[PDB]
């Protein structure tokens, strides 16, 4: 069954699974739905299930009027069922988001190295570590035509490491002093989290 599904807030997305039923040949002058009842599965423990069903099943009985079709014969009776569900973010928080945070955070440690050469070279290994991680994620997470929450973190990582590379070069090649601005070990994680906050609007 198809429906309008929005996965942008993945892995914290909620979905409405819908069933729509209608007579194929008989309009509501010949066949009309009088009532609809829905019975679902009895759940023991939801921690093992991919989705969590929040609330009872909603139902509707409406009329669909078709322009392309005697008078009052262009209207069909329709049943609609809706099952509201919420994804289980557990797996994605521990195996995907958390390791990605330690990676981004770990990349902030380049400011604690005591040499331009060491700061700029280790940054490349950090960049390589985010790319290696983007493959691991894409190989498991679902395909979509838009970015998710995890995709934005990955982009944030790319931006952090790239920004740090520009700061490492500027500090060292602007003067001949350098080590003092490299004492931005606190200023960088805050600017990232600062931007990281305005991204959540």
């Amino acid at each position, epitope marked *: 069954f198809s429906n309008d599904m929005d996965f942008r807030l993945f892995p914290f997305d909620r979905q409405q699974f819908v069933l729509e039923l209608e007579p194929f040949s008989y309009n509501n002058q010949q066949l009309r739905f009088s009532d609809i009842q829905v*019975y*679902t*599965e*009895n*759940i*023991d*423990n*939801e921690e093992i299930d991919e989705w969590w069903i929040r609330g009872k099943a909603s139902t509707h009985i409406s009329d669909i009027r078709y322009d392309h079709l005697q008078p009052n014969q262009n209207e069909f009776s329709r049943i609609t069922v809706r099952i509201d569900a919420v994804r289980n973010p557990s797996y994605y928080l521990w195996s995907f988001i958390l390791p990605l945070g330690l990676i981004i955070a770990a990349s902030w440690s380049v400011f604690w190295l005591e040499s331009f050469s060491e700061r700029l070279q280790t940054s490349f290994t950090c960049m390589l570590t985010v790319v290696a991680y983007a493959f691991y994620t894409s190989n498991i997470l679902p395909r979509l035509p838009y970015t998710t929450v995890i995709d934005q973190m990955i982009i944030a990582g790319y931006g952090s490491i790239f920004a740090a590379i520009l700061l490492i070069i500027f500090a060292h090649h602007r003067q001949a002093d350098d080590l003092l601005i490299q004492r931005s070990r606190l200023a960088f994680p805050l600017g990232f989290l600062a931007i990281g906050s305005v991204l959540v609007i």
Partner: nanobody
Amino acid sequence: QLQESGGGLVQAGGSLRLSCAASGRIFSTNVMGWFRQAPGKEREFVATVGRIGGSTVYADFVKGRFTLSRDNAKNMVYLQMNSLKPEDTAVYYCGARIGGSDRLAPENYGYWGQGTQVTVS
């Protein structure tokens, strides 16, 4: 922890209402089921809820004589037993399904209660 009650002595043809109080991490009473064990025999299934809404699973000897209900408010289940016969004499236990893929299997139940004796003449 589970505790049974409601057993006792009844005349062949009489009724009893067993009760199972549930305490602890139990989101719903669906996981609970009733069992019985006579002296020398193995613990045999009696009743638990069905997978799909509105269904209940009963052992083949029940033959419509027993009825499992639940009071999610008090977090409990009741086994209403009617038309009892001497064959039903046993200790009736209350169990909680802890996973597995077989509602009728004692191996998939833990947290058993002390049991409550049912005796029919």
